[PDB]
Amino acid sequence: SEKDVQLMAEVVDLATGEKQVLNDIRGRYECYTDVGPSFQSMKQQNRA
Amino acid sequence: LNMRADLETYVFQDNLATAMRRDGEIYQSIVNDIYDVPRNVTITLEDG
Numbered sequence: 001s002e003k004d005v006q007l008m009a010e011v012v013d014l015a016t017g018e019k020q021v022l023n024d025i026r027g028r029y030e031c032y033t034d035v036g037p038s039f040q041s042m043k044q045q046n047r048a
Numbered sequence: 049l050n051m052r053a054d055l056e057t058y059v060f061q062d063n064l065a066t067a068m069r070r071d072g073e074i075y076q077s078i079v080n081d082i083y084d085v086p087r088n089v090t091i092t093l094e095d096g
Contacts, residue, residue: 005088006087007088007089008087008088009087
C-alpha cells in the first residue's frame with residue numbers, strides 16, 4: 001500500500017489515473033513551508 | 049535568462065535541420081524484443 005518494491009518503475013510521485021484523470025487525495029500537505037536558495041534540479045540541491 | 053531562452057529555440061530548430069537526436073550513452077539498441085520491458089531481476093537478453 002506503502003510497503004512494496006519493484007526496482008525500475010518505482011513510484012516516488014506517480015499516482016493512479018483511474019478510469020478518468022484529475023483524481024487526487026485531499027492530503028496535499030506533507031511538509032512545512034520553508035524556503036532556501038534556488039535549485040532547479042535534485043542534483044543541484046545535493047551538491048550544496 | 050535570455051541564454052536559457054535561446055536554448056529553448058535552439059533544440060527545436062537544430063534537431064530539425066541536423067535531423068538525428070536519438071542519442072544517449074551505452075546500450076539502448078540492438079538484439080531481440082523492442083523497448084524497455086525490464087523491470088527488476090532480469091539480466092542478459094530476451095528483450096535485450
